[PDB]
Design a protein around this ligand. Structure first.
Ligand SMILES: CCCCCCCCCCC[C@H](O)CC(=O)SCCNC(=O)CCNC(=O)[C@H](O)C(C)(C)COP(=O)(O)O
Ligand code: SF4
Ligand code: SF4
Ligand code: FES
Ligand SMILES: [Zn+2]
Lengths: 198, 83, 27, 687, 116, 114, 231, 83
């Protein structure tokens, strides 16, 4: 019941984390190998294209594929959204996480140039959280309804939205309607009040 | 009327529902079926009540049939036990 | 080893409130 | 700097000498798993579930009773202090009956969690469990005590907060059962707290037996309106009806405890409740009708009647926001006959300088007093969580309590000076013995319960007390910020009324009878149709149909404090905000709006139209209503005395007696209580 | 670059919240109080911003509780008064901050109950 | 205090964009009514456009107006194209929704919510 | 959640024993037909570097000849103990991608064969009751188990605060969950990487210079199911 | 028209209130005597310059800011209202 882990990796990757931090001192704010044996290089938002280009095209760190781009929203932090880019190196069989912070009104650059995989993921981050990607070809709603107002995955958006749809005979169209739910969603306050010893 | 009331007042408009229809109501009230059961006599001061089963019944609790004044009732089966 | 018996729901709840019944005779 | 330095797993905190090992962990932020240790209850050491290991020490120590010494590093997450918890939890669980899906302290268990976080994944008890015999401790506490972990919290609370030493341990060994030896019910106020304080679900609440389960309950933090201590409380609502009201901690007002009344009278809140606006119709029967029709019944009469023909007898649980909306309306037709049912002597500065009518010493000041001369009240049943204050300060500190009232059960050792209002003059003269006792007091306080003021010589009783406070202050030479004179209320909407400028007593309405009266939640008998002009047009504004409803030409249902964002203020003027736990029922509406709307139909529209605006209005009438959780000190007493000296009145020889002589007196005292089925069950149990 | 602006960063128009749920609605920043029923203090450490309680009514057909308040189950969790006031001002809601109520230090001693 | 510009530096500069969108929308309303076989009149719709472009007419943080344009333009793209059907566009007219009264007496008279 | 029923492994052998004939029966039907090869061969060719850049990560990656499976590169579970051959392909065209999918069905029969031959006696869930629920008999006879069942079902595991991106080779391609976790019992974020969001993006590049009918083949060879893409 | 009450809202400890506070300590005891049962509700300000409100016949009120107004001035200001 304790994961079978290899310490070789923690060390090897930790060493790469120092390598990346040395090669790019201007944009990397903190590098840490977590105990899950994964690496995370946290970069200033301005370093989004420089840091990812170095990883996509460096002989000692080829990170060809963008696994995903997602944005955790911690409402407390001033810069709420924390865009996170997970990248994979087929050559070295290892994976890296580059995460940067973006606020509601400060856009971050688009890596579509560095990886064309991001063309869609960046559109989803805009639709879901409202982060805007600079000089991004065709940014527009990927997942939400054509007329949807509001960014849904933001922690400040109600689970069930504000509008619902129904067919109204009188107008013969699918009309929206302020949300009335027949059974509110019981919100369970299930969370223990005795903290676990770390 | 269900074992728990629910009977609609004659005026209640909530009665249309059953027009050209009827009302799903269980005839086997557990308030009475459990009363139609023999108080389980026992010798020991305390007794168990696995719910007449091991892992197919209810959690196993020990009842104190210590006072004939009261027949212990396992909070799960409603079975009265007569010391 | 059309039917009239259609399930219809309830609110099996015992009505959870009681309104003052106004006084029967005037003052 | 007597701080002593001690290490919490290294954080090296510095603490006062005499802080327990458990307390040292708290300031670092660590929590010792604990049972049988409650902050305001004595340390007992019964469970020993808190064993920790100070460093390079032979054995584990009890964090609840070990005074931390110099430079002992506590190791709270060591390999030892976990075997000292993995092995205790083995024992508590071994004799425990597994009926967690019966135990309504399901998610509210401090014993499953600690098992589920610090205890063991499995069981090794392959033997036979024990069982105890359920007894009846009352109609409020369901003691399924086979659950008891013999943690003796109950025994202590029953003996240190409530002074009722009825509970106790009986027997030794594994059949020590903590229940009353003879079956005598645990009848006392402060009784329901045992539920909240037993971490096990052995004894829990009988009304809230099985109606809910805690994860579901949505918890809204609000204010107690049943009594004038204004105890903080949390109303637990599920799917829109209140399921239970349990205390939330306010250091100064209710420190984790609430009264038996304000915890079991949430049931009274759900029946006999007004909902639709009926209007007398036909032969006189009241007939449910739409607001528009009921409001213009009232508005038309209001336009017809001039000032002093329209009066308001408010009283009981009405909020400050309605009280200013009713005054602003009746002044816009120039009657300032607005009044409250509880008569506070106004034959003086009267309602004019708050020092007059507010416990001046705060509830929390009772802890620092040196002698308290309670005159005219049974604090126990009027303001229970202030009786507790004098309970704690007579035990942990040394308050010398003296009562000039009926000799009454006070849960502490008081000195019964006598049952006569004139002996107040005896102390003022220095004739009575306790005159020196006070002379010896460096910080004395005097308490006069409104329940006395309500007699006919109440003006004289206030004046007589003010004279004695004056020379008590002079003889002691007590410092100015220490305030000897304070008076406690027993009606939630009194202080606010008095502050907003409402004149107390229905004496003014008595002398000139109003053509139209808008009773605002008044269920008191202060005036009756029998005592009103023949027209007798009267419109009840309230939540429960009790006394004012059947004698009412119009019924305008309102809400209750569980159902509106209103403000209340307790006795030392701390304004507090009730939050809406449940939307008001039926067509019933918030009290302030009914009156803003009636004014619009009437045409003398009130200025505010949203509640922030009414809060801004309150700021204009009395500015310490817009300010919450703050007690303000400006003791404009000296000038109060000067006017008291001008007032000449006779204190009649009749002894001053509190109306709540014994606890059956206490249970049912208000609409929301007199309608309580739980309170009714409690009343018959006493009788 | 580095333009200067002086607003409270009202993103009320970027949020997408229907006006009536951004105008007539009061958030109540507060640190949740402890469940008297338990003695764990781990649920009274982070500041929450919950909204006002509007109508919770009954579905005529099954008796369930129904509601029209889209922002009813919303309890944003912050880490300091400062960061909660900021979010509410940011989104255009009205706030009612309530100061924290940590128990004061009460001195406890075992021997004390043995005095006479 | 200092803030990076999203696309425009001064509110005035940005408004240049706000107008370059108004025009676009205005010149499009006519097309939509016909293309999406909507029933509302050109005038009626063009009214809506102003209303909206007007609703937002109080913000002064360029970055916000730099952002609402974008969102604004995106809504044209969809509408210019027929990515949005009649249902979508007609939703800007609350056809079924009964406009909520505002008068206090008009609200007190209905619904406990303020 | 529960152990295999007493007859499952025999029945899986009988299915796997005869399934191989069913594959080549489809094999003879579609692999050599003039009509299928013309419809599939040289349609939607994706070059190797373009496939990595577009984040294809699946049979779409291996069909173009890139060597990556995620079951042999970054092994999960016990795949490190089972032997199989990744079916890579050249000429990255629908056909080569079809042929790869038919081979993986065959290679999976080789892995299923090993799992039935070497499945260990043991229990099916880790049994620290804090993470996996206690057994039905134990919760009904021992108090520690009732408390652990009640808390686990009502509240939860309360996983320690952290964040992880774990990718396994789902049949479509790399399926990954970026689970961000506060100490709470309920997650904070769960980004489902869908092999499919990347593949459908490639449709415009892959289906260029192609007629309406080719597009029907292009979507078919991405094995896209919209639940994963839409999430 | 006819004064009905006068509410003197004075901060508790500030230069502005200073003096207003004096009025109370020097004349309230007498004012109340002189024109009694004139509700004079002295209440507390909150960092808001001292003010004196006064209801009149039909819902009418007047304000007079007395921030930093000296004692004698206040005295008269009260006398002006109860002219
Ligand atoms: C038929 C379909 C309806 C679709 C309508 C349209 O697509 C939606 C839309 O208006 S997209 C958002 C437009 N919103 C802005 O473009 C920001 C405006 N910015 C201001 O208004 C400033 O406050 C300012 C200082 C300029 C005031 O100046 P002024 O009053 O405009 O002059
Ligand atoms: S107390 Fe009630 S809930 Fe807590 S463990 Fe014992 S039974 Fe289960
Ligand atoms: S009853 Fe509750 S409190 Fe009293 S001992 Fe048993 S457990 Fe401890
Ligand atoms: S908690 Fe320390 S003795 Fe029980
Ligand atoms: Zn049973």
């Amino acid at each position: 019941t304790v994961r079978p882990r290899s310490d070789v990796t923690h060390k090897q990757l930790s060493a790469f984390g120092e390598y990346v931090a040395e090669i790019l001192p201007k944009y990397v704010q903190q590098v840490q190998v977590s105990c899950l044996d994964e690496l995370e290089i946290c970069i200033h938002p301005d370093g989004v294209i420089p840091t990812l280009t170095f990883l996509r095209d460096h002989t000692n760190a080829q990170f060809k594929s963008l696994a995903d781009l997602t944005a955790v929203d911690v409402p407390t932090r001033q810069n709420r959204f924390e865009i996170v880019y997970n990248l994979l190196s087929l050559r070295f069989n290892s994976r890296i996480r580059v995460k940067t912070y973006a606020d509601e009104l400060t856009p971050i650059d688009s890596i579509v140039s560095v990886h064309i995989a991001a063309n869609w993921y960046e559109r989803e981050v805009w639709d879901m959280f409202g982060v805007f990607f600079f000089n991004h070809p065709d940014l527009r709603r990927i997942l939400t309804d054509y007329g949807f107002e509001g960014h849904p995955f933001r922690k400040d958006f109600p689970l069930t939205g504000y509008v619902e749809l129904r067919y109204d005979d009188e107008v013969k169209r699918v009309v929206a309607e302020p949300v009335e739910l027949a059974q509110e969603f019981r919100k369970f306050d299930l969370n223990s009040p005795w903290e676990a010893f770390p | 009327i269900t074992h728990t009331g629910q009977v609609y007042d004659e005026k209640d408009y909530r009665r249309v529902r059953f027009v050209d229809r009827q009302k799903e109501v269980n005839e086997n009230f557990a308030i009475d079926l459990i009363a139609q059961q023999p108080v389980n006599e026992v010798e020991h001061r305390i007794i168990a009540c696995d719910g007449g089963g091991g892992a197919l019944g209810h959690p196993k609790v020990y009842i104190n049939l210590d006072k004939e004044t009261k027949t212990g009732t396992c909070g799960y089966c409603g079975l009265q036990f007569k010391q | 080893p059309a039917t009239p018996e259609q399930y219809v729901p309830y609110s099996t709840t015992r009505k959870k409130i009681h309104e003052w019944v106004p006084p029967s005779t005037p003052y | 700097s007597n701080l002593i330095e001690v290490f919490v797993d290294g954080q090296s905190v510095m603490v006062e000498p005499g802080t327990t090992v458990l307390q040292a962990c708290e300031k670092v932020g660590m929590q010792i798993p604990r049972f049988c240790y409650h902050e305001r209850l004595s340390v007992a050491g019964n469970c020993r579930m808190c064993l920790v290991e100070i460093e390079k020490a032979p054995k584990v120590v009890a964090a609840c009773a070990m005074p931390v010494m110099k430079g002992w590093n506590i190791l709270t997450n060591s390999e030892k202090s976990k075997k000292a918890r993995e092995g205790v939890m083995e024992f508590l669980l071994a004799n425990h009956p597994l009926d967690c899906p019966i135990c309504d302290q399901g998610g509210e268990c401090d014993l499953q969690d600690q098992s589920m976080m610090f205890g063991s994944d499995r069981s090794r008890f392959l033997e036979g469990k024990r069982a105890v015999e359920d007894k009846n401790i009352g109609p409020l506490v369901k003691t399924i005590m086979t659950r008891c972990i013999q943690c003796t919290r109950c025994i202590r609370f029953a003996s240190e907060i409530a002074g009722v030493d009825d509970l106790g341990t009986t027997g030794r060994g594994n059949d020590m059962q903590v229940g009353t030896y003879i079956e005598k019910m645990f009848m006392s106020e402060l009784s329901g707290n045992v539920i909240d304080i037993c971490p096990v679900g052995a004894l829990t609440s009988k009304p809230y037996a099985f109606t809910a389960r805690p994860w579901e309950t949505r918890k809204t933090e609000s204010i107690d309106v049943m009594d004038a201590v204004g105890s903080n409380i949390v109303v637990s609502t599920r799917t829109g009806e209140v399921m239970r009201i349990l205390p939330r901690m306010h250091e100064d007002i209710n420190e984790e405890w609430i009264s038996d009344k304000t915890r079991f009278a949430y049931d009274g809140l759900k029946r006999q409740r007004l909902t639709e606006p009926m209007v007398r119709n036909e032969k006189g029967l009241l007939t449910y009708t739409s607001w528009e029709d009921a409001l213009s019944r009232v508005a038309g009469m209001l336009q017809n009647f001039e000032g002093n023909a329209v009066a308001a007898i408010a009283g009981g649980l009405v909020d400050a926001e309605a009280l200013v909306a009713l005054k602003d309306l009746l002044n816009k037709v120039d009657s300032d006959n607005l009044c409250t049912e509880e008569i506070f002597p106004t034959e003086g500065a009267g309602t004019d300088l708050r020092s007059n009518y507010l416990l001046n010493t705060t509830i929390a000041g009772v802890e620092e007093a040196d002698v308290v001369l309670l005159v005219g009240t049974n604090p126990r049943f009027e303001a229970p969580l202030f009786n507790a204050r004098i309970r704690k300060s007579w035990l942990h500190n040394d308050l010398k309590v003296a009562l000039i009232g009926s000799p009454v059960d006070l849960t502490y050792r008081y000195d019964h000076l006598g049952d006569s209002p004139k002996i107040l003059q005896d102390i003022a003269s220095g004739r009575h013995s306790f005159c020196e006792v006070l002379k010896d007091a460096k910080k004395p306080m005097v308490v006069l319960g409104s329940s006395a003021l309500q007699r006919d010589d109440g003006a004289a009783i206030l004046v007589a007390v003010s004279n004695m406070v004056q020379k008590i202050r002079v003889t002691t030479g007590v410092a100015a910020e220490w305030k000897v004179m304070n008076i406690l209320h027993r009606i939630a909407s009194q202080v606010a009324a008095l502050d907003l400028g409402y004149k107390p007593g229905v004496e003014a309405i008595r002398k000139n009878p109003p053509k139209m009266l808008f009773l605002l939640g008044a269920d008191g008998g202060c005036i009756t149709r029998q005592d009103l002009p023949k027209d007798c047009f009267i419109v009840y504004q309230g939540h429960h149909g009790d006394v004012g409803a059947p004698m009412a030409d119009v019924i305008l249902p309102g809400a209750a404090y569980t159902e509106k964002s209103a403000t209340y203020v307790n006795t030392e003027g701390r304004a507090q905000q009730t939050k809406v736990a449940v939307t008001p029922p039926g067509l019933a509406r918030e009290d302030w709006k009914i009156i803003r709307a009636l004014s619009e139909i009437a045409g003398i529209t009130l200025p505010y139209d949203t509640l922030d605006q009414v809060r801004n209005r309150l700021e204009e009438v009395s500015p310490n209503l817009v300010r919450y959780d703050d007690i303000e000190e400006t003791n404009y007493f000296q000038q109060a005395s000067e006017l008291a000296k001008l007032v000449n009145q006779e204190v009649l020889a009749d002894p001053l007696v509190p109306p709540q002589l014994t606890i059956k007196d206490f249970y049912m005292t208000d609409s929301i209580s007199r309608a309580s089925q739980t309170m009714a069950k409690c009343v018959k149990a006493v009788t | 670059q580095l333009i200067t602006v002086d607003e409270k960063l009202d993103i009320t128009t970027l949020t997408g919240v229907p006006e009536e749920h951004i105008k007539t609605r009061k958030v109540r920043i507060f640190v949740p109080a402890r469940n008297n029923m338990q003695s764990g203090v781990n649920n009274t450490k982070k500041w929450k911003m919950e909204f006002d309680t509007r109508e919770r009514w009954e579905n005529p057909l099954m008796g369930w509780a129904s509601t029209a308040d889209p922002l009813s189950n919303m309890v944003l969790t912050f880490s300091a008064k400062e960061d909660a006031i900021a979010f509410a001002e940011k989104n255009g809601w009205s706030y009612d901050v309530e100061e924290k109520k940590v128990p004061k230090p009460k001195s406890k001693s075992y021997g004390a109950n043995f005095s006479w | 205090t200092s803030v990076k510009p999203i696309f425009s530096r001064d509110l005035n500069e940005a408004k240049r964009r706000v107008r370059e969108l108004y025009r676009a929308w205005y010149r499009e309303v006519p097309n939509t009514v016909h293309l999406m076989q909507l029933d509302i009149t050109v005038k009626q719709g063009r009214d809506k456009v102003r209303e909206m472009f007007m609703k937002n007419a109080h913000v002064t943080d360029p970055r916000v107006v730099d952002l609402l344009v974008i969102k604004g333009k995106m809504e044209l793209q969809e509408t210019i194209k027929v990515w949005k059907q009649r249902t979508h566009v007609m939703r800007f007219f609350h056809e079924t929704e009964t406009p909520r009264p505002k008068d206090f007496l008009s609200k007190f008279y209905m619904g406990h919510d303020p | 959640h529960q152990d295999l029923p007493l007859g499952l492994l025999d029945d899986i052998y009988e299915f796997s024993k005869n399934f191989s004939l069913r594959i080549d029966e489809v094999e003879e039907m579609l692999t050599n037909n003039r009509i299928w090869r013309n419809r599939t061969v040289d349609i939607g060719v994706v070059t190797a570097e373009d496939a990595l850049n577009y984040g294809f990560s699946g049979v779409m990656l291996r069909g173009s000849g890139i060597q990556w499976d995620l079951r042999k590169t970054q092994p999960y579970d016990v795949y490190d103990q089972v032997e199989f051959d990744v079916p890579i392909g050249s000429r990255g065209d629908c056909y080569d991608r079809y042929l790869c999918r038919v081979e993986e069905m065959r290679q999976s029969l080789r892995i299923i064969e090993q799992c039935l031959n070497k499945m260990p006696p043991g229990e099916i869930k880790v049994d620290d009751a804090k993470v996996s629920p206690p057994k039905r008999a134990e919760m009904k006879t021992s108090m520690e188990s009732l408390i652990h069942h009640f808390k686990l079902y009502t509240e939860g595991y309360q996983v320690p605060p952290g964040a992880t991106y774990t990718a396994i080779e789902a049949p479509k391609g790399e399926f990954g969950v970026y689970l961000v976790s506060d100490g709470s019992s309920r997650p904070y974020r769960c980004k489902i990487k869908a092999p499919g969001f990347a593949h459908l993006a490639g449709l415009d590049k892959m289906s260029k210079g192609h007629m309406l009918a080719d597009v029907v083949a292009i979507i078919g060879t991405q094995d896209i199911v919209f639940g994963e893409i839409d999430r | 028209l006819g004064l009905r009450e006068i509410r003197v809202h004075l901060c508790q400890r500030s230069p502005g209130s200073q003096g207003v506070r004096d009025f109370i300590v020097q004349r309230y005891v007498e004012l109340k005597k002189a024109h009694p049962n004139l509700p004079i509700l002295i209440r507390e300000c909150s960092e808001v310059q001292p003010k004196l409100w006064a209801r009149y016949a039909f819902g009418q009120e007047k304000t007079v800011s007395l921030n930093n107004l000296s004692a004698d001035e206040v005295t008269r200001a009260m006398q002006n209202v109860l002219s």
